[PDB]
């Protein structure tokens, strides 16, 4: 049961950050939150990763399950923040007023990461739903 409970508590923050990010992606205010959340999610990943990596070590039994998934994630997550920045440079038009003012690319990058998380959690869940040894 700990497998489900643990992952759950880990999904809270995972999806949380992604959500808060969308709020900025679609609403590029460029007031400071861009760089603020940038390092936030970056530092939040490295930390959370250490925990997931601690439970799944590799010294006597080399067989990473969730780790292999958590790693590939940081990869797409890293280059992602890079593109967002460059985009902000090119487009120097971020007026203030109300709401509504995003871009297609930003939306696509979000929709992709969205399903990526859903298929991820289920990936390891279906790969080994049992609580047996390995």
From Swiss-Prot:
Q: Where are the transmembrane segments?
A: 7-27, 32-52, 65-88, 105-127
For the region Essential for TMEM35A/NACHO-mediated proper subunit assembly and trafficking to cell membrane, what residue ranges are annotated?
33-40
Subcellular localization(s) per the UniProt record = Postsynaptic cell membrane; Cell membrane
Q: In which tissues is it expressed?
A: Expressed in neuronal cells. Expressed in macrophages (at protein level).
What subunit structure does UniProt give? Homopentamer. Can also form heteropentamers with CHRNB2, mainly found in basal forebrain cholinergic neurons. Interacts with RIC3; which is required for proper folding and assembly. Interacts with LYPD6. Interacts with CANX.
**Family indicated by similarity:** Belongs to the ligand-gated ion channel (TC 1.A.9) family. Acetylcholine receptor (TC 1.A.9.1) subfamily. Alpha-7/CHRNA7 sub-subfamily.
Function, in words = Component of neuronal acetylcholine receptors (nAChRs) that function as pentameric, ligand-gated cation channels with high calcium permeability among other activities. nAChRs are excitatory neurotrasnmitter receptors formed by a collection of nAChR subunits known to mediate synaptic transmission in the nervous system and the neuromuscular junction. Each nAchR subunit confers differential attributes to channel properties, including activation, deactivation and desensitization kinetics, pH sensitivity, cation permeability, and binding to allosteric modulators.
Protein name as annotated? Neuronal acetylcholine receptor subunit alpha-7
Q: Which gene encodes it?
A: CHRNA7
